[PDB]
Amino acid sequence: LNDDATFWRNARQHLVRYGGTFEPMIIERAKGSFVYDADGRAILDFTSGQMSAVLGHCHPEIVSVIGEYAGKLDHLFSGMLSRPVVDLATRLANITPPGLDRALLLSTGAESNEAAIRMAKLVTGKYEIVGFAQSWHGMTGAAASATYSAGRKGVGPAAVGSFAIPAPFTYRPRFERNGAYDYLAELDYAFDLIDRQSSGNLAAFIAEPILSSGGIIELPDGYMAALKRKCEARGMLLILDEAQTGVGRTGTMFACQRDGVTPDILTLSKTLGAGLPLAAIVTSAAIEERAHELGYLFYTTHVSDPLPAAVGLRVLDVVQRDGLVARANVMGDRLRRGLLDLMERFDCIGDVRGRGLLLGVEIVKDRRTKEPADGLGAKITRECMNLGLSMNIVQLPGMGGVFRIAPPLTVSEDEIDLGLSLLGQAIERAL
Amino acid sequence: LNDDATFWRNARQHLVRYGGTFEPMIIERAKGSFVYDADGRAILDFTSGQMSAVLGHCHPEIVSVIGEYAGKLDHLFSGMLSRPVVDLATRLANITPPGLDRALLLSTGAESNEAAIRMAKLVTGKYEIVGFAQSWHGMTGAAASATYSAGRKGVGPAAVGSFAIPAPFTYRPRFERNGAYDYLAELDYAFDLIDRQSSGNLAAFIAEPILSSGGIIELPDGYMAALKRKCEARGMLLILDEAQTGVGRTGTMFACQRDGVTPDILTLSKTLGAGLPLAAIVTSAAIEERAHELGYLFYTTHVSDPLPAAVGLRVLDVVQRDGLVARANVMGDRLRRGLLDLMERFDCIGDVRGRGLLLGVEIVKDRRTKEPADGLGAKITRECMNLGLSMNIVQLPGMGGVFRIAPPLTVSEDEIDLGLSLLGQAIERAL
Amino acid sequence: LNDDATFWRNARQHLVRYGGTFEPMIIERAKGSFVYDADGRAILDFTSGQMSAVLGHCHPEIVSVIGEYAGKLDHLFSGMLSRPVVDLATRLANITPPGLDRALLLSTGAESNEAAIRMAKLVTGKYEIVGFAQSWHGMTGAAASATYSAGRKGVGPAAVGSFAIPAPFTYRPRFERNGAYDYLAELDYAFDLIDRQSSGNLAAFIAEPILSSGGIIELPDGYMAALKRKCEARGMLLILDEAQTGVGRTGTMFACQRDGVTPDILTLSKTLGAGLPLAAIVTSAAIEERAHELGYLFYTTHVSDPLPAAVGLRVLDVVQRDGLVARANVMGDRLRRGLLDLMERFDCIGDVRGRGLLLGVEIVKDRRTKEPADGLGAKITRECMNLGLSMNIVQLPGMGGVFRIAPPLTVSEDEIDLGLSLLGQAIERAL
Amino acid sequence: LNDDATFWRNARQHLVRYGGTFEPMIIERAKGSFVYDADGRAILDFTSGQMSAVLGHCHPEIVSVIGEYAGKLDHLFSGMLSRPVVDLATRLANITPPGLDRALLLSTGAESNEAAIRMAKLVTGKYEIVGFAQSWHGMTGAAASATYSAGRKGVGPAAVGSFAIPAPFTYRPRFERNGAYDYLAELDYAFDLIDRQSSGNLAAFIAEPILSSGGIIELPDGYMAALKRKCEARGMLLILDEAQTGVGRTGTMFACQRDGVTPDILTLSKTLGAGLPLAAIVTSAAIEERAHELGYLFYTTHVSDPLPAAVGLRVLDVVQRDGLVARANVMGDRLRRGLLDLMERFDCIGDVRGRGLLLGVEIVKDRRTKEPADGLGAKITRECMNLGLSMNIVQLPGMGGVFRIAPPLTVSEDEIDLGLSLLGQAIERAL
């Protein structure tokens, strides 16, 4: 039973609490799209852990590579090169759009954004960084100063030169022109302001192609191109954070591919490691060259460590081989439509959005007022659990509770249907 | 041969350069205190990789646990608890001094210091952070603003409220009282200044018990206690960064134990993971409690992930069982004395310092002028390699080149003698 | 002749150049609404110097008081009280709205805003300051960080916690709701953003009732009240900068009176001194009380100096006695209508705005495109001079050249007509 | 009687309290080295007001010029040149050392330092500013961030890039080499630190030749030269703040003349205006030239206003004519020796320092412990008043109470003796 009093005792006694609340169960094993409790109960992992297990839990291929290297090449002096490192660097260079040529292999999302941000500042000689007011880039320093969805308060001043602009949000529009939402005009409006406050040191813009923590907010048609150009005109880099979107999730290997806009620096993480700590940035040769010229510095313990590298490599190998990127679209379509039928039944569902297998469901009270569903979310979330479905709802100012849905690219047709089933039951029972 | 033209081609073409220079060899395998090149040549790893492989490369016990969990419990939704997590948290609570009760499990050194620093600011409501002018805490935001050994230039303003004080350096003293080096008076002097510049927002002091990147600088007798008290009087936390010192390396499980001063927050990393990415902070229940009360937030992808946790646990298990902490003193003594004999032979060696198996050798031209050996270091470093010994020299302003020596706690008597041998040959041949 | 080669030689040789260009004439004397050159030519001062000579140049009453005190009470140790100081403080308390009770007498506009801003931060314990993107508050530190009309570039980082919002600009509207300019919605929109970037330290909002340097931008009906409330809800002070508007200029003794919204802190300057350096802030007793409790500090050489105080007093005496505030409306109306007739004749005039005797004329190319008149301004400005009328045009991003018009409250009907005359001639000749 | 209940009532009711405490008297008139109360009692102004009345109160020559211009040329549009402006600019260029060629005429000390600091940052392209930990430069923004004697707390973050070094203080030395105070070594020590914290953006060093508010601290022999060189090597400007020292006070027209080191920018104020608000900066033609090239901006209401300019001119005229600079040395010597005799009598006097007519007397309990006299100061200060002598004591951390003594350069032999008399009586009566 999950009830083990010693477990919970030691948990209460020795764990630092870092946000939210611990699920009152003890997880003992994980396989495929399922995690299992101490009673053996099976929970459908509709969030891929913390949106990382792209190939699911304990993917035989992953297992082998991990053991294959665990005992052969493990961790090395940061000045030593090895095969997995170089092969991954190359692979990344070969699968990302043209213009992205060089990679640095790290360990975490924030770490990746930090390295990117640092290189941007170096290269440009400037330091002001603009982001979305609903962004999420990490808990560390620079990453955190660019994160506006949460954590800004009670911890002192942000980094000098930090600005934000509103993100384009089609569901709840706020900027109009000739009776319509003109998300571009909004962009122009926003940048004018930026311009008026800048000190003449704009160095980069950092953005997620899809605002995950922000509520599964997809940047609408033409935006990125527009953005890009806004940067171009001001001598700024465009850093795209693809932690949740990279690696096939949204139906393309990378989200920037859909839009057809390649960034100056692209960051990867969660999905690249498939649950293990691997991260990376990829940039153009020129930028790397100038960064070098100027003595760029991003020296760590785990930069260029074989084990992870090796793992990142397998994962790409399999996504490609098993054609998971396509799959994403296919199961994505399946889940999407299923989500729409629920919306057909219940009025508490106000929006179904996302792309591929990165989907969001916005709970609302009045499907015409689009009034946030107060607590209803927690309830549903809660019944999903009782029911055996792991979910995650995000709640932000002025929006309704959002269910972030993101199963494994390896998810099965049956599991999809199964989640959809439990989701409906939880809903009806939650009302 | 390490000469593989495709390897090097792809290395030149796709790797981002993050600091220093890549060793012109290809590493293919690692076992114990050795890493092997593409020709099979064996290199004695006298730096434990990037000072992490505490149990050496591919430690059978580590291997098993990694595989044992790789296929059983891998990565989880950050809200889910598991056994390895809770057991490690407990273990840490049980082996660290009294006053250290709760832990948060992360992935990297900088990440750990960031979480610590963030909690400090939260809890106190202040934001100014003091560190040593020769410090090294990480490449990310807050970690980097407190790092003064390198990387301050060309990347924009540091974090608001950043101060530094000189570290006590017995070899090259600079503060005198009644014809003698009074490192405490220096401390008092230093803090007065701080006090005069603070805005009334001092929140913490962050320090390494032994300045590794700073040149293997050990804080002298009574200092830490003094420091601690300096903080106490100003309502500041004392955060001890034990990334290179924690886990038995300096002869004690933790360096703060020797001095008999327990910090408000203690950070661990490199050594805890033994080459894998595991990190953590440990603090008092009260501080955790208040941090909670105020909504502390340090939510990441890999916080509380079973695999690493599991790995951290084994490592403690083995250090304890195999009595490596003691061993540290014993082989440490061996290596130390060996280092002294070389100093007896060559005049280029000006100091032999450190503790346990964290030793430094300061190369100097005039052993009376204590004039830095210009380039001589690089040479020796270079011959050690040709000879089959991996080394690392650090070079800072106003000091001589420093060889950071830190082999595995699992190192053998013979390997020690072997390194000492090659080290002498490299030296004599370098002159 | 203004041609004096020694004059100009020494001018070129020893003057630091601080902005714009020196008028190629030498001024020898000033009386009423006129300044005279070296040839004796009379120039109508339609800008009241640098918008200060409210009673005109060398106002007999001013002259006497200056001499009356120059030889009786001059400058004192900042701890010594005197009559003029206390009488002025009282007068200000008696003529400003209720809620404004205590005054601090300074020397300059920026100085006044700085003291206000400092007190705000003290009292609230916060430090973030919001202003208009078209604001002007001074060249010194805090004053300058809140100034967004000019000077942000090439001089390093602004003050930490500096934000700006767009000012309501009826002529060139940019925010729409149901096909209309909803300046309030704009306000709400703007503050949401602020809110998302604040670190939880908003302390005050600083605003000019009429954006003078920003292009004579008047805050539209209901705005201030709205603003005020936006602050109220966030525990922020509202600091109103009345340097150009205070002292009768816009038809009321103070501009905040019209709107019927009294600020937490009100600043005065230019007009209060009538060309001499006198400045002041006025606040509520409570705020003063708490500021005191906390040890507010604003100690200077000229704080509470009799001469200026004395001068400030006379000026109030006369504005009141001669009923200049009313007059303002009357001549204001006269000038306004005259400005409209010109607009009736020429297409280059796109807007006539302002209040009282603080008027702006926006030059535009297409009176339907509202396309800025490129250079045309400089030309007109230039012919006004040749013609004997001193003017000032301000040029900002995205707007047309703006003529700031502000004659003395003592201006005569004939002078008004005279300026209007020359203004037309300059225009027609400029085309 | 000073007792006027209405006066005090309105004082309590409408005055903002800005620091310290208001003298319980009402000043009605001021002439020469005396200010008079409401009872007619005469108070010897041993502080020249707030150290400004260099020619004393109501100096006939000053009076005339003020009236002479009050009615002829008063305040002008900042773009208009006039004779007094240009003549003063020239005069300053002619009386300051070589290398100082151009001037900008302002209104206040802080204002002057701000303009200087701003120009420094512009010209260099950097923003970090170093000052003394016992400095005083003004209450406004940048001026205040460089002020470390007081006001750093409770008002939010200082300006980004703010550093301080300890000032050389011969009386209470703290840095030793071969058993002696090596103020230069201290300098070297200090800058090393700075260097380690800078981000590579050091732009200027701002210093008072004599730390007035800091306790009358004179920079010892060779220091300034050393300082200068420290700057030179780092591409930094040296800005000398001569608000209390400029204009003959310390025995030279400017204090930088004694040392024989001319700064890159020199600021003047208090003394230049002789109680009226006039201020200025003086710099080299090159610096002005580059500042211009880059669009330096320091546009205010009172920049280049005739009245004050005119006043500044007379003052120079008289200092020169009446040979007050010499006088300074002569009466200075007189007062100095007189101060020494008191020290001969009382043990509470621990130091007599200063230069010319800018003298300090440090009160101490144990003339061997050099233990600060707790409150004794206030007492003496208090009896001086009862006795008819206005004084000022400054009290800083770790030092004894300091009497800042600075009478008018026009002071008489008898007044000097008179102050010395009362000072002794106050002392003996205070014990």
Ligand SMILES: Cc1ncc(COP(=O)(O)O)c(CNC(C)(C)C(=O)O)c1O
């Ligand atoms: C776009 C993006 N970038 C970086 C990160 C954080 O990376 P690390 O937390 O592993 O350092 C997230 C976070 N993911 C969390 C856990 C915050 C989530 O909300 O799912 C992210 O969304």
Ligand SMILES: Cc1ncc(COP(=O)(O)O)c(CNC(C)(C)C(=O)O)c1O
């Ligand atoms: C005390 C201390 N704390 C944190 C870190 C960095 O942790 P990560 O680089 O893994 O984020 C080091 C660095 N170690 C490096 C690689 C910089 C080294 O110099 O050995 C460190 O010394």
Ligand SMILES: Cc1ncc(COP(=O)(O)O)c(CNC(C)(C)C(=O)O)c1O
């Ligand atoms: C609202 C407001 N507040 C303060 C000030 C500046 O005061 P000081 O320049 O006298 O320090 C102005 C400026 N007036 C100038 C000269 C900038 C102008 O544009 O007319 C101002 O407009």
Ligand SMILES: Cc1ncc(COP(=O)(O)O)c(CNC(C)(C)C(=O)O)c1O
């Ligand atoms: C060196 C120096 N520089 C600037 C200033 C301030 O100028 P303002 O206060 O007139 O703006 C002082 C201050 N004088 C005060 C009143 C603070 C004093 O302590 O005497 C100063 O000492």
Ligand SMILES: [K+]
């Ligand atoms: K490594």
Ligand SMILES: [K+]
């Ligand atoms: K996790």
Ligand SMILES: [K+]
């Ligand atoms: K005064």
Ligand SMILES: [K+]
């Ligand atoms: K002027």
Ligand code: NA
């Ligand atoms: Na590519």
Ligand code: NA
């Ligand atoms: Na413990």
Ligand code: NA
């Ligand atoms: Na009132």
Ligand code: NA
């Ligand atoms: Na000169």
